[PDB]
Amino acid sequence: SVPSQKTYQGSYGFRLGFLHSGTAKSVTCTYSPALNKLFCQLAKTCPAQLWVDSTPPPGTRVRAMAIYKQSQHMTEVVRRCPHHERCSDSDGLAPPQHLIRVEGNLRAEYLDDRNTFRHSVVVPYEPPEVGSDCTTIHYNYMCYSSCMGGMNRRPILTIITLEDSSGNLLGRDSFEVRVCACPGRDRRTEEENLR
Ligand SMILES: [Zn+2]
Known part of the structure; x- marks a missing residue:
């Protein structure tokens, strides 16, 4: 089988957000909205923001695959x-x-699906902190x-799903990923080719 990659905000208005890191030759992680593609270096921090219109129930989780x-x-x-x-x-x-790891979250769980053999990493969804409007998960591509x-x-594509405590679908978003030596240059090159 194949996991669905269909964008779905669901009842809570779930969607991803990315920082605006630019394309300087030195950048370690940069996101291209035009290509819906994240470019990052090996094992470097990739901040992924989680936005919702309303807070989902306690026990909600966020999975990456x-x-x-x-x-x-x-x-x-x-x-x-x-x-x-x-x-x-x-x-x-x-x-x-x-391939995908979550940084600095001791509650991260890694799953090897007994049926599909696919890998994923899931963490508890935490509502935004006082003063913050979104929650951020830091991913690493290995x-x-x-x-x-x-x-x-x-x-590859990374699929981020918001799920209830049973693993049922509440929301879904996704983005393409390229793990490479020079994310800044590759993003500039691919965006140029698109132009
Ligand atoms: Zn390798």
Whole structure:
């Protein structure tokens, strides 16, 4: 099977938000609204904002999962390459095979679906803090898009789902991701090609 990637705000008006980091050669993570694509360096912080019109119930969670963007590769589980899954760089919670990790959240849970074998990381949804209007989750991508034997230059999409305590769908959003050496230059190049 293949997880749905259909945008769905749901009853709570759920949607993602990204910072405006620019395209300076030095940038480590930058989002392109025109391409709905996040460009980031290997294992660097990727801030993802969670916006809602109304607060969902306590027990609500937020899950992140990657799938290949190209339909001919959609059924293939996205995982870290043969090299990175063996580099012993786990933070003590993320299985070494998982591409996506959540930074600084001890309540993060990593799932290896017993039926689909797909990987995902889920955390409890926390309402915005006093003074804040959104909640932010910091993600890390643990392989380059170019890793041989892994993504192998194939583009991926990250699907973020808001779910209830049973795992039922409440909202969904998604974006393409390219993990590369120079996010600033690649974003500029791809946006130029689009122009
Ligand atoms: Zn890799």
